[PDB]
Homo-oligomer: 258 residues x 4
């Protein structure tokens, strides 16, 4: 048929898997970027193989990509070329970016500063510069850049991480408005306090019911957000249902960033 | 059998009709407040009688209410009283509020100041004071207060209207955070440049396609928003699929308020 | 000497007294609205009579106004009429507005709602509609409206107070932009954690242990002084800065950053 | 006597010259970083030499620095090393950062992206990492980082410039809150539509019709002067205001309101 194509990076963890499932139910074809290997590999919460079988049952064709560095121009340009080759179209793109670094500002090394710029900014710059040309040509496109809820409140101990996330949102706003007249939407979603293996291990909430209660007590809604909730909101900005929002940052942290 | 209940005010125009259809598709019973009469009556784009026919097809019981002053405590208290009588529960509420007024700040009469304070603030204060107790008791609830996109950018010629909309969003942020510990979400949507007869006639664009073209020229996405899109976004905050957002204001103006 | 004139409401308390002194030192004539009486009167931290003696020493004429209700159109229209009489000009206006109310949102009575709308909004609407025509005509004016730092972050327990302070800031933004082409600036300043009898008595700090707990909530770990707030406020009213209009400035030690 | 010390980078242009004068008048010793040479050298609107004469008249000792790369850790660490050598103390710092780049987002080369990351961010990260340790040990300090008014509204055609300026403000907010604890304040001032040879030449206004069209985009319908900017900047560095940290102040005549 004429199914549309969604691209989801880091799709072996975080929101990617759940987003891929519902995006398939919306009738999409999927190009998943992620980490190769099985569940025993680090950063692999749902293996590529495990998804392909389930997404096929939803009727989805899936192309997997795992040999690109998304902090560089080449890695992102090569990713989009391999999408347009397999499917000939790019309608939706969900670019998951960033890598967490915390600590005192005066304790930040030059390597931490170089890494946070590469993951929070270079990923967005080269990511958008690669997904926008195919959409501007087709006259229609939808893009969600996944930054961080700290972008709306860069706090102590999160200076260079929150600050660059604030810069990524600012870029998304400018880019979202610059290409609005071509009929493409670029929006940012910043989350925090999400219930997935990454956040659970980072906050030491894994296995400790008390520490998890303490982490939840920091959320106004007194809970951790679920991937199915995030995927639903994310898919709503990438499935063609909403076409009147661009250049905006949506906080998804249970009220923490209100 | 155990179908949640959604309250939608002003449901004879604006997002009400379209929201009622999709909310019924999410499996919700409805209580529609609005203006009684037929299509010829002022402020009735979709009459009551036409909707209960459609909403019953989708499987929704409907209660109609049209004899209340939503700018007063009594009107809103009576609305919720009659909701808890017919269905015995209030899971979601969509409180459309406000009435447009523009002009130079120094030209604003004391009547305009009194009316903008009643439609932009009194409706929100009394509306939220009414719908919140049933949800706090239930330990779960989703509320969307419709203010205006001008609340994010109170501009010249819209001083008192936009300013009080900024206050309504401010109330929504505080209320949304204050009751998040009870499982209740309260969020604000503020639109502009919508495709419905209310804005179409106010912008003098119901006919003149050149005036409509110069109107869409002010929207970054170069078009007017449809009610089917707004109902989709609004339903996402009222159907139980997203329970990790509260106290937040969402712009829906094609990037105008980004 | 054709000295510009500054109007300062609520001037018997809060920033009013300290702002008048510096404003005088910058060569201004003063119109002080405030509560009449002595120090034993409620709401009077620095009595009227005390300020005229000092304000005169700094070389300043002061007109005292105390018989207006600033929540009404007549109260503010009368105040400005009496300014344009004694001095015939209005260059700077500092409109202290608002009145605190806190508590659970669902506990808020209809009277608390009507009062916070009168003090946080009506004072701003009528206060601005009164001071602006005289400046728009002169082609130059500078106005600072005092809202609250809660306007920037309306939090639980301060729903209707902080929410209406947000609306006041919103009004101040549109008004400051709308009349910028006439060369008049309208900006808002919202403070919190100030060191003066008003805040000091409401937080039960007037108990060094409680006061230390108060300041622990401030990022700069201290309370702000009126001399500091007068300086920042006078900077937006002395003509030195004329490139800022329609903006809100948090002044809470970083609490509202 | 113990004259306090203020550091001002890029002091051969922008606010630097005018800020130097008023901060000298406020009883501050100075350390100016800038580009050495005469008025013929690019980027020198007020030559070094012409300044040292004036600040000396206002009673200020001034140490000059022109051999550091402020986008690197070494240049900043050396600049502050030489400040604590000549004067033994750092009380105030005005870190002017950034370099303008505009154009379509999809036309931006990897060199522009690299250059704007270095001028809008690396200058801030290394600037604050250098000036902050001396003030934390002193228990008091005042910093003002100069970003851009585009940080508050990163618009089309200013994608990666305004976006990185927004990240610079985000860092300033976190840093200003993280060290308020130690009695130091870090705040941001982002300007636009200023009357100095830099902006005048970029917008081709140095044509009265283009200048008038430029002032038409400003709500206050005028261009800001360095004497105005220095007043606001000095107020955040002279120890008068000590109740604001981690905040971003727009200074564009209301353009970023
Ligand atoms: C020092 C701080 C910094 O960010 N850089 C640039 C990146 N980098 C390293 O961290 C090591 C070598 C290098 O180029 C500095 O050099
Ligand atoms: C109930 C809530 C409200 O605001 N009002 C109007 C104001 N009012 C009082 O609070 C008491 C008398 C009155 O008019 C309500 O009646």
């Amino acid at each position: 048929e004429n199914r549309p194509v969604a691209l989801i990076t880091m799709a072996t963890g975080y929101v990617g898997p759940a987003l891929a499932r519902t995006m398939a139910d919306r009738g999409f074809d999927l190009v998943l970027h992620g980490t190769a290997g099985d569940g025993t590999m680090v950063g692999v919460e749902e293996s590529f193989d495990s998804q392909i079988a389930d997404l096929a049952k939803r009727g989805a064709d899936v192309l997997t990509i795992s040999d690109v560095d998304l902090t560089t121009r080449t890695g992102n340009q090569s990713m989009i070329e391999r999408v347009l080759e397999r499917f000939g179209r790019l309608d939706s793109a969900c670019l998951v970016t960033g890598l967490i670094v915390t600590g005192k500002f005066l304790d930040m090394t030059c390597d931490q500063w170089a890494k946070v710029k590469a993951t929070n900014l270079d990923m967005v710059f080269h990511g958008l510069q690669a997904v926008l040309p195919p959409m501007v040509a087709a006259g229609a496109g939808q893009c969600v850049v996944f930054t961080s809820a700290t972008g709306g409140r860069p706090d102590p101990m999160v200076s260079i991480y929150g600050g660059t996330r604030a810069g990524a949102n600012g870029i998304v706003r400018a880019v979202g408005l610059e290409h609005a007249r071509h009929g493409v939407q670029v929006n940012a979603i910043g989350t925090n306090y999400m219930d997935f293996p990454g956040f659970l291990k980072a906050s030491r909430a894994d296995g400790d019911p008390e520490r998890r209660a303490m982490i939840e007590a920091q959320v106004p809604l007194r809970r951790l957000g679920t991937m199915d909730e995030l995927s639903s909101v994310t898919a709503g900005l990438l499935d063609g249902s909403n076409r009147f929002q661009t250049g905006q940052f949506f906080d998804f942290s249970g009220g923490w960033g209100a």
